[PDB]
């Protein structure tokens, strides 16, 4: 029957909770209370980036840390030159409803995918003057979210059908499928070292999956609702998670438990596109109250507010070198913020 | 003053050309009416799409009527959480909701009662607080033959009116309109469809014209 299996699963959950609680003598706040505070931050934006007429999801800069890929609901993919405010490429989209931006480590490919259940790879370095579709991937029964770029040939994606898929660029066939989530899967930041990846589902669960083995190894449940934001703390031993309520949680990888949560009584709206910095001191969260916030990922306290936006901030990202931070909202405006 | 480094002159000129193409595409899309198609089950969605298209994602319809390009999106092929992708369709010209009149007896709570909560969630949505909704009462011909044998008392326990189409349809429309709690800012255009005198496309055109007048009034000051 199934009653004994359910009882065994409950006992295993209790054992896992006991093991997690055993190694919880001290918290991050107690250790970090004896360090110098980050202090007030007055980061301001020096950019315009006015080329869109729809909601913006325009992150995943790239390794060169200057080019930008921008996807909106108008059905156009815009490649931005951040330094000079220039549009490099304007690729028409077959489907206007997309929520995905990727630039690939090589920079010669751009991934796009939304609720059309199609993932399109666009080749940038073509012998002609235009940008054409290099590979179309199908096999997902839900809206696409995140199109990370392991290599020039391997692309991992998440959809709303409670699964994740790794596809090959050369052959449009499935390679490795992860089926362990009970809800829609987004927030699939691709590690600092590309050998691993984690994904946050809609059932307040964040699960890590082996790229080669293709099996789940760790799960985290510390939220109370759907998760729509994941970073990976470029150190490689922790990752940040954001949910539809105004709270973020930092989960350690080796400890396998939530380290600390960042929340305030003055924030109630949602959270989208949580990303870290190149060192990890600053954690930037895109809230739904028409502005973004900066949190200290070490002690607890806030650091700054980025209020230079009109509509709800939907995407946020940082360059590889941490020179500047791109923020995009539904007001078809992209703001690039840099330190003083 | 920096001579713009020669090649960056051509780069910014290419940027201006891209901007020109972008604004041309935006102007073209601004004159395009976007309609959202919704339904509980079958709801006669296929029949309406097939009839009005000539007169696993989205089966988009780009039919034209009286120098107007209409966009229709069907999201019935997606089985996932609705609220995650429901904000992408905000700002549409109108939302088309189709409900079958012959669904007050069939189950899998009958189908129409299950459609009431979907209608409530769509009309009362925060993203759809300013978009007019066109309701279609499909299966009109089946209603005539399947109301005589099956009384309306099974569905509505608080109905005591005459067992006639002209009153039962009005009662169903009255409850469907009563599901709207934002009547002061939104309106519902209810229409009945049949396989004859196909004015459904004309009804959609009239509702689209009314909502365009509504929007232009907000843009042009008064209301």
């Amino acid at each position: 029957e199934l009653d004994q299996l359910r009882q065994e699963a409950e006992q295993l959950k209790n054992q896992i909770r006991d093991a997690r609680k055993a190694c919880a003598d001290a918290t991050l706040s107690q250790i970090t209370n004896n360090i110098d505070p980050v202090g007030r931050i007055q980061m301001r934006t020096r950019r315009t980036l006015r080329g869109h007429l729809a909601k913006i999801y325009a992150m995943h800069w790239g390794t060169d840390s200057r080019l930008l890929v921008s996807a909106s609901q108008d059905g156009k993919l815009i490649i931005w030159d951040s330094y000079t405010t220039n549009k490099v490429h304007a690729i028409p989209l077959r489907s206007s409803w997309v929520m995905t931006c990727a630039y690939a480590p090589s920079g010669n490919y751009v991934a796009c995918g939304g609720l059309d259940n199609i993932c399109s790879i666009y080749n940038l370095k073509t012998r002609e003057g235009n940008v054409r579709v290099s590979r179309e991937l199908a096999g997902h029964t839900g809206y696409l979210s995140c199109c990370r770029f392991l290599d020039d040939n391997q692309i991992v994606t998440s959809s709303g059908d409670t699964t994740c898929a790794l596809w090959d660029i050369e052959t449009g066939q499935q390679t490795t499928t992860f089926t362990g989530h009970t809800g829609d899967v987004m927030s699939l930041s691709l590690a600092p070292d590309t050998r691993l990846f984690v994904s946050g589902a809609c059932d307040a669960s964040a699960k890590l999956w082996d790229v080669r083995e293709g099996m789940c190894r760790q799960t985290f449940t510390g939220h109370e609702s759907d998760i729509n934001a994941i970073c990976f703390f470029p150190n490689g031993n922790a990752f940040a998670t954001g949910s539809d309520d105004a709270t973020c949680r930092l989960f350690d990888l080796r400890a396998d438990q939530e380290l600390m949560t960042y929340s305030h009584d003055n924030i109630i709206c949602g959270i989208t596109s949580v990303s870290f910095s190149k060192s990890g001191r600053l954690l930037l969260a895109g809230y739904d109250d028409f502005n973004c916030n900066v949190w200290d990922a070490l002690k607890a306290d806030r650091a700054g507010v980025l209020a230079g936006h009109d509509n709800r901030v939907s995407c946020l990202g940082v360059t590889d070198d941490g020179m500047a931070v791109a923020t995009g909202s539904w007001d078809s405006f992209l703001k690039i913020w840099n330190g003083s | 003053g920096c001579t713009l480094s020669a090649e960056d002159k051509a780069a910014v000129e290419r940027s201006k050309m891209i901007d020109r193409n972008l604004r041309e595409d935006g102007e073209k899309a601004a004159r395009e009416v976007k309609l959202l198609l919704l339904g509980a089950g079958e709801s006669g969605k296929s029949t309406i799409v097939k009839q009005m298209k000539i007169i696993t994602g989205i089966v988009e319809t780009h039919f034209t009527f009286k120098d107007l390009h209409f966009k229709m999106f069907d999201v019935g092929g997606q089985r996932s959480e609705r609220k995650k992708w429901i904000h992408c369709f905000e700002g549409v010209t109108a939302i088309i909701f189709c409900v079958a009149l012959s669904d007050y007896d069939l189950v899998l709570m009958n189908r129409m009662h299950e459609s009431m909560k979907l209608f409530d969630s769509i009309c009362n949505n925060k993203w759809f607080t300013d978009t007019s909704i066109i309701l279609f009462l499909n299966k009109k011909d089946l209603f005539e033959e399947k109301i005589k044998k099956s009384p309306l008392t099974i569905c509505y326990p608080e109905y005591a009116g005459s067992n006639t189409y002209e009153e039962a349809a009005a009662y169903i429309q009255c409850q469907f309109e009563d599901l709207n709690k934002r009547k002061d800012t939104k309106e519902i255009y209810t229409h009945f469809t049949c396989a004859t005198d196909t004015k459904n496309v004309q009804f959609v055109f009239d509702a689209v014209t009314d909502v365009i007048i509504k929007n232009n009034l907000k843009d042009c000051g008064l209301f």
Partner: single-chain antibody, 231 residues
Framework: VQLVESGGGLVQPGGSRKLSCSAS????????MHWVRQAPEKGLEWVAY????????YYADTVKGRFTISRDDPKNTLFLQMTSLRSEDTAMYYC??????????????WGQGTTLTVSSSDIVMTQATSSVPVTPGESVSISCRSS???????????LYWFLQRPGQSPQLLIY???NLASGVPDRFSGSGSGTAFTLTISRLEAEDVGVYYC?????????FGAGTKLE
């Protein structure tokens, strides 16, 4: 991608003739076009250029106010019309394509060329060596000099290196003296600083001899080098 030109022949001085460069295999409307002339025995000489959409049109000093150029995207072709010709205009004309964005490769593809005969503050770019013997297997360095520092206040130099085989159209080898052109073997390399550039060929093989040309892109108004011949 293919560029084929027509309209050559022998023309009396003072006449008018037009050259048609028809493009087949790429996006002509998104590519700026240049016309570059080569004398039968002298070096390569710039003529004119027209941007995408006919926005910016430039002519060289010897040809300013006399020549005309035009484009038509639907027909995918380039016309250059020539009035009041002289005995100094007898040259092989090349129609070439160039695109201008971040990390682009202008002058990547050249045309086939047309033979035209007539019977009867600019930056100078000099090469110290005009001809040097070469052997299949040694490394050879070619030195390029400029009258002005090509390093602008943006972080990149505007060098271009072109190879002309004995009987083939010139092809780009390196651009901005920091990136290798597509389809070019890794043996070629370039380096140097403003006013003094070098190009190193290591593990030289056969079927690569020819004439090297050195191009600057600081201003418009681009001048070739003397041309280094290897044999």
């Amino acid at each position: 991608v293919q560029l084929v030109e027509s309209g050559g022949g022998l023309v009396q001085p003072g006449g008018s003739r037009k050259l048609s460069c028809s493009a087949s295999g790429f996006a002509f409307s998104s590519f700026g076009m240049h016309w570059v002339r080569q004398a039968p025995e002298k070096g390569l000489e710039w003529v004119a250029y027209i941007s995408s959409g006919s926005g910016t049109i430039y002519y060289a000093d010897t040809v300013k106010g006399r020549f005309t150029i035009s484009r038509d995207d639907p027909k995918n072709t380039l016309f250059l019309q020539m009035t009041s010709l002289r005995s100094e205009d007898t040259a092989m004309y090349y129609c070439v394509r160039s695109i201008y964005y971040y990390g682009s490769s202008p002058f990547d593809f050249w045309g086939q060329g047309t033979t035209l005969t007539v019977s009867s503050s600019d930056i100078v770019m000099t090469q110290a060596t005009s001809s040097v013997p070469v052997t299949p297997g040694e490394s050879v360095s070619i030195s390029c000099r400029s009258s002005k520092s090509l390093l602008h206040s943006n972080g990149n130099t505007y060098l271009y290196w072109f190879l002309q085989r004995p009987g083939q159209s010139p092809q780009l080898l390196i651009y901005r003296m920091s990136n290798l052109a597509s389809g070019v073997p890794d043996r070629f390399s370039g380096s140097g600083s403003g006013t003094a550039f070098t190009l190193t060929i290591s593990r030289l093989e056969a079927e690569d001899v020819g004439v090297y040309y050195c191009m600057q892109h600081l201003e418009y108004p681009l001048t070739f080098g003397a041309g280094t011949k290897l044999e």
